[PDB]
From Swiss-Prot:
This is Bromodomain-containing protein 1. Disulfide bonds: none annotated. A zinc finger (PHD-type) spans 10-74. Scaffold subunit of various histone acetyltransferase (HAT) complexes, such as the MOZ/MORF and HBO1 complexes, that acts as a regulator of hematopoiesis. Plays a key role in HBO1 complex by directing KAT7/HBO1 specificity towards histone H3 'Lys-14' acetylation (H3K14ac), thereby promoting erythroid differentiation. It is found in: Nucleus; Chromosome. The chain holds residues 317 to 394 of 1058 of the full protein. It comes from the Eukaryota. The modification N6-acetyllysine is found at residue 53. It comes from Homo sapiens (Human). Highly expressed in testis.
Length: 79
């Protein structure tokens, strides 16, 4: 049928399921690791947080772009 929602709820490896709250997909396109925001806070994994500021439309536009890697994504690529 004509389904307006297109929310591709990803599978959270820290769950083995999908839906419950919000999903976040880890960086690196050759990886794409999906989990929950609650899982990220729970593990305390690597999250880079870049704030973009703009004034588009004669005002202020704020977009935060978080670059996150899954917990088992940190060891691959030894810093
Ligand atoms: Zn989870
Ligand atoms: Zn990953």
């Amino acid at each position: 049928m004509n389904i307006p929602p297109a929310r591709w709820k990803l599978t959270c490896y820290l769950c083995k399921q999908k839906g419950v709250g919000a999903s976040i997909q880890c960086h690196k396109a050759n990886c794409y690791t999906a989990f929950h925001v609650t899982c990220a806070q729970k593990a305390g994994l690597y999250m880079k947080m870049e704030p973009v500021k703009e004034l588009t439309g004669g005002g202020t536009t704020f977009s935060v772009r978080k670059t996150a890697y899954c917990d088992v994504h940190t060891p691959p690529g030894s810093t």
